[PDB]
Amino acid sequence: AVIGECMIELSQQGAQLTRGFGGDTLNTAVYLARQMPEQALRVHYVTALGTDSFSGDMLQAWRQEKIETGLIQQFDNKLPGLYLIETDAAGERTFYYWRNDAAARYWLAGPQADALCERLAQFDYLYLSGISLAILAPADRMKLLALLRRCRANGGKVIFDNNYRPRLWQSREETQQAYREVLACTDIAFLTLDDEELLWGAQPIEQVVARTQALGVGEIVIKRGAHACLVFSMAGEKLEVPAIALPPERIVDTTAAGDSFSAGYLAARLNGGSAQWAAQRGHLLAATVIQHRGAIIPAAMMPEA
Amino acid sequence: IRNLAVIGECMIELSQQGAQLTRGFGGDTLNTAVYLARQMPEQALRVHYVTALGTDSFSGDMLQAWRQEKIETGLIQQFDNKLPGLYLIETDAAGERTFYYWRNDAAARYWLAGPQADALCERLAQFDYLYLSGISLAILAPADRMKLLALLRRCRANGGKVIFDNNYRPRLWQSREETQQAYREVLACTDIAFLTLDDEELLWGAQPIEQVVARTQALGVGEIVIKRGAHACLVFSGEKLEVPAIALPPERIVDTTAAGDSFSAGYLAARLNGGSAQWAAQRGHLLAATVIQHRGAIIPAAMMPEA
C-alpha cells in the first residue's frame, strides 16, 4: 500500500501547456507496478480524491497502470490538489503548488477510515513519504502512526521515503519530531542524502545511520543521485553500489528519478533479488527516467525488467 | 628560505546583526594565506599575498593587519584612483548568512593590468610555490587571465608547484562555459588541486565520484584533494586515500565560513613540510574544525590548534 497524494499537474512551455497528474508516492506506486507482475500483496494506492471528472481520469489511468482504487475515498465537497511546472528559456524548472485543502489531506478524516485502517492493518507492505506525513494534520498524523504500529503488530513491514519539502511543514522542528515518530514506527527507510542533510544538518554517514537506527529501523537505503548508493541491510551488510554513469549530453528533465529508484530497487528487492542487484535495478530505472521528459515516462522507453 | 605566494583578492567586509555593524577584511585567498602563514614557521616557509589595493585608509588597515599576520606585502601594488572591493554579510534571525558583493571595479582586478605586472611575472616565475583560486581567475579580465596562466606555466618550468582551489561563484564569470574553459586552462598548470564537491558539481554538473578525478588527472594534476564538508575527504594519487573529517555535535557548529579555505591552508602547511597526504588531510580537518567552531572568517590567533 502506498499512502500519499497525487496532484493535477500542469506543464507549461512557452504559451503551450498541457494537463496531467503527478505525485511522489504515485511515481513510486506506478513505477513499482510497471515492473511488478504479482507478489504477496498487490494493493497500491491509499489516497483520497474528489468526485470530479479529473479524479476519475486519474483513477482510470491508474487502473490502466494495474493500480487498485479500492481504498480511494471520494469527497464531493473536496477537490484534488493542483500544481504547475514552468520551464524558462534555459530549461530550469519552477514548481508552484495549490494543495492546502487537497482531498488527499483528509483521507484519514473520512467516515470510513476506521474500516480501511483495519483492512490496512492486515496489509503486507506499506510505503509512504515525508510529503504524505506532511500533508496530514497532526491529529490525522497520530491516527496514521497508530495504524502503522498496528500493521507492525500484524506482521506488516513499513517502508518510508524521506522526501523533504520544507513548505509543507510548519517548522523544521515539527518535521524533526514527525520524522522521528514515523521512523520509530518504520522498518525500512529510503533516505535521500540531500533531504537528510537539509533536515538535520550536514553530518557524516555514520551519525546519520546511528540516528536512524536508534529509532529502530532495520534496513537503511541512502540515495546519493549520481554518486554511489549506500545500503545497510536487514542482516547487517554494508555495501556501496555505484549509479550508472551518464554523459552530460543525454541528461534531460526528470522530476521522478528518486521516486523511480525507490520503486525499482523495491521491485527487484521484493521479487527475491539481492540488495546489490536491487540497487542496480533502481540505478538503471533512474537513469532511463532521467533521459526522458516527464515524471512518468512512456512504457515503451522503460527498461525491460 | 621557501617562498609561497597566494594570488587573489581581499575585500572590505561589513558584518551586520540588526542595526549593529562592524568593519573588517575578508577573502578566500587571503583567508588561506593567513592560515598558511600562521601554521608555517617564518624561516621554513614565506607566505606572500599578491593583490592590488588603493591608497586609502582601508587598504592601509589591511596592509598593517597582514604585516601583523607575518605576510610579506612586497608585491602588493597600490592604485591611487582605485579602491578595495567591498562586501556585506547579513545575519538572519535563525542564523542564516547572506552575502552581498560590490567588487566589479575593485583594485585587485587590475593587478595584472599594471605596468609592473610583466616585471612581477618574472619575479614570481622563480617562486617555489604559487596558490590561486577560481575567484582569482574570475575577477581578472581575459587578457590578464591569460597572462596569469602563462606565469603559472613559467613557474612550473622553473621548478615551481602551482596549487589551485575551485572556489566557484558564478556571478563573476560571464557564462558557465567561460568558467569551465578557464578552469581547464588553469588546471593544466595546476600541481595540487583542492576541489570542493559542491563547487565542482555546480560548475560541471553532477558526475560520479570517479569522473571528477578522471577529468582532473587527464588535465595533468598530480595530487587531487576533494573536500566534502562533513563527509570524508578524498586524496587521489593510482593511490586513493579517504581521510574522515572530525565529527562535531550540532551545538558546536557556529560558523561554516572559511572552512574550506582553512582546510586548504592546513593541508598545504603539513604537506609542504615533508608530511604525507593522509597526515596533511588530518591536519586540515583539525584546523577546519577549529575554524567552524568559532565565529568569523578569520578566527583569532589565540584559539588556533597546537602544531
Burial class for B36, CB neighbours closer than 10 Å (0-12, 13-18, 19+): buried
* Residue of chain A nearest B211, judged by CA positions: A245
A226 and B208 in contact by Cβ < 8 A? yes
Q: Is A182 exposed, middle or buried (0-12, 13-18, 19+ CB in 10 A)?
A: buried
Beta-sheet pairing, A125-129 with B11-17: unpaired
β-bridge partners, A22: A7
d(CA A89, CA A92): 8
Whether residues B205 and A243 touch (CB distance < 8 A) is answered with no
B162 touches B152 (CB < 8 A): yes
Work out the burial of residue A117: count CB atoms within 10 Å of its CB; fewer than 13 is exposed, 13-18 middle, 19 or more buried: middle
Distance CA A60, CA A69 (A): 9
In whole angstroms, give the CA distance from residue B139 to residue B8: 9
| Helices B209-219 & B197-204 angle (0-180, nearest 10) | 80
Read off the amino acid at residue A194.
Answer: D
Looking at the complex, report in whole angstroms how far the Cα of residue B172 sits from the nearest Cα belonging to chain A: 19
DSSP state of B301: G
Q: How far is A8 from chain B, CA to nearest CA, in Å?
A: 30
List the single residue in B208, B209, B244 with the smallest CB-CB distance to A204.
Answer: B244
Contact B192, B284 (CB under 8 A): no
Pick the residue from chain B with its C-alpha nearest to A249: B205
CA angle B295, B300, B305 (to 5 degrees): 100
Cell of A138: 497532526
Rounded CA-CA distance A103/A107 in Å is 7
The residue in chain B having the minimum alpha-carbon distance to the alpha carbon of residue A172 is B94
A259 is catalytic: yes
3-state secondary structure of B232: strand
Q: A203 vs B232: CB contact, 8 Å cut-off?
A: no
b/e burial code for range B212-245 (CB count within 10 A of at least 16 → b): bbebbeebebebbbbbbbbbbbbbbeeeeeebeb
User: Residues of B near A (CB-CB distance < 8 A)?
Assistant: 205-209, 211, 229-232, 244-245, 247, 250, 253
Q: Are A136 and A110 in contact (CB under 8 A)?
A: no
Q: Choose, out of A197, A200, A203, the residue to mutate when testing the contact with B (most B CBs < 10 Å).
A: A203
- Contact A226/B206, CB-based, under 8 Å? yes
Flag if B250 and A225 touch (Cβ within 8 Å).
no
A204/B230 touch (CB, cutoff 8 Å), yes or no: yes
Helix %, strand %, coil % for chain A, to 5? 40, 20, 35
**How was this structure obtained?**
X-ray
C-alpha cell at A139: 491529529
Of B207, B230, B253, the CB nearest to A226: B207
Q: Please, are residues A128 and A4 in contact by the beta-carbon 8 Å criterion? A: yes
Q: Which of A112, A101, A266 is nearest to A189 (CA)?
A: A266
**Cα B60 to Cα B293: distance, rounded to the nearest angstrom:** 30
**Contact call for residues B204 and B183 (beta carbons, < 8 A):** no
Cα dihedral A52→A54→A55→A57 (10° resolution): 130
DSSP B250: G
CA distance A227 to chain B (A): 5
Q: What is the DSSP letter of A136?
A: S
CA–CA gap between residue B147 and residue B149 (Å, rounded): 5
In this complex, do B208 and A245 lie within 8 Å of one another by their Cβ atoms?
yes
Adjacency order of strands within the sheet including B97-102: B20-26, B11-17, B85-91, B97-102
For A207, the closest chain B residue by CA position comes to B247
* Interchain CB distance below 8 Å, A227 and B208: yes
Q: Which residues of A touch B244 (CB under 8 A)?
A: 204
In A, which residues are within 8 Å of B229 by CB distance? 202
Contact B205 A245 (CB under 8 A): no
**Buried-state track A152-168, b at ≥16 Cβ within 10 A, e below 16:** beeebbbbbbbbbbeeb
B154 in Cβ contact with B147 (< 8 Å): no
The closest CB to that of A203, out of B207, B209, B230, belongs to B230
Least CB-CB distance to A202: which of B208, B211, B230? Answer: B230
Q: If you search the block for the grid coordinates 551519525, which residue do you land on?
A: A207
Q: Report the gap between the CA of B272 and the closest CA in chain A (Å).
A: 28
Q: What are the C-alpha distances in Å from B40 to residues B128, B212, B269, B301? A: 15, 30, 6, 13
- Residues of B annotated as catalytic are 261
- A contact test, residue of B198, B201, B207, B285 with most A CBs within 10 A: B207
Least CB–CB distance from A228: residue in B205, B209, B253? B209
Asked if A204's CB is within 8 angstroms of B250's CB, the reply is no
**Beta strand residue intervals within chain B, DSSP E:** 3-7, 11-17, 20-26, 46-50, 52-54, 77-79, 85-91, 97-102, 129-133, 161-165, 192-196, 223-228, 231-236, 240-243
Is B211 within 8 Å of A245 when comparing Cβ atoms?
yes
Q: Do B291 and B239 form a contact (C-beta atoms < 8 A)? A: no
What is the separation, in whole angstroms, between the first and last Cα of chain B? Answer: 20
Cell of B25: 577584511
Using DSSP, state whether A141 is helix, strand or coil: helix
Minimum-distance CB partner of B231 among A204, A228, A248: A204
Residues in chain B with CB shorter than 8 Å from the CB of A251 are 205
Of B233, B237, B201, B241, which is closest to residue B218 (Cα–Cα)? B237
